């Protein structure tokens, strides 16, 4: 089955 | 400011432009150096085909940037 979206994350 | 235009054949052209110049003006400056009509020129930067009536500032094109020049004929 298809993966769920990842959780938001911080990008610096 | 100085920007560069590089062709698919690797030729490099240097231009003097202003941030407020339109893409069509840039094509005119290429014509003045190379003799290519503006309507035969495609200019591409950072993945986008640059639209004739937008300015260099609209695309956040800065001094010393290189634009890609693709002609419309002969691949």
């Amino acid at each position: 089955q298809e993966p769920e979206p990842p959780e938001p994350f911080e990008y610096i | 400011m100085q920007i560069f235009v590089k062709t698919l054949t690797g030729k490099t052209i240097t231009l003097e432009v202003e941030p407020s110049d339109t893409i069509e003006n840039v094509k005119a400056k290429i014509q003045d150096k190379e003799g290519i009509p503006p309507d035969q020129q495609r200019l591409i930067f950072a993945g986008k085909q640059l639209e004739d009536g937008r300015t260099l500032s609209d695309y956040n094109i800065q001094k010393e940037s290189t634009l890609h020049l693709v002609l419309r004929l002969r691949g």
Binding site: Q1, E2, P3, P8, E10 | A46, H68
Partner: protein
């Protein structure tokens, strides 16, 4: 007309310093047009809408995994980080993630 590389993937969006997923089912692909130019594209697998279509030349960009997330997040990053497009893989298995990344870089930087 056939895609040079394709793989299921969704989009993400960066605001401030936070990257948040778009929930849509999507497809990243590379395609050469009849005028020989190389395009990096993203299309909505549900509606079929091609939402991103970039014309790419060698040394414009690199496609690289984002360790910050592992959520299988990849970014297409343009020269001097002028532009970043974020994606999350949607293939059910991870076994081809790295090879898809290698192929994207190969076709964009040596087509």
């Amino acid at each position: 007309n056939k895609y040079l590389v394709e793989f299921r993937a969704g989009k993400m969006s960066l605001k401030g310093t936070t990257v948040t997923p778009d929930k849509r089912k999507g497809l990243v692909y590379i395609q050469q047009t009849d005028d020989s130019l190389i395009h990096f594209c993203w299309k909505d697998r549900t509606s079929g809408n091609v939402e991103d279509d970039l014309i790419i030349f060698p040394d414009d960009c690199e496609f690289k995994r984002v360790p910050q997330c592992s959520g299988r997040v990849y970014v297409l990053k343009f020269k001097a980080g002028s532009k970043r497009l974020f994606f999350w893989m949607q293939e059910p298995k991870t076994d081809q993630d790295e090879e898809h990344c290698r192929k994207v870089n190969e076709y964009l930087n040596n087509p």
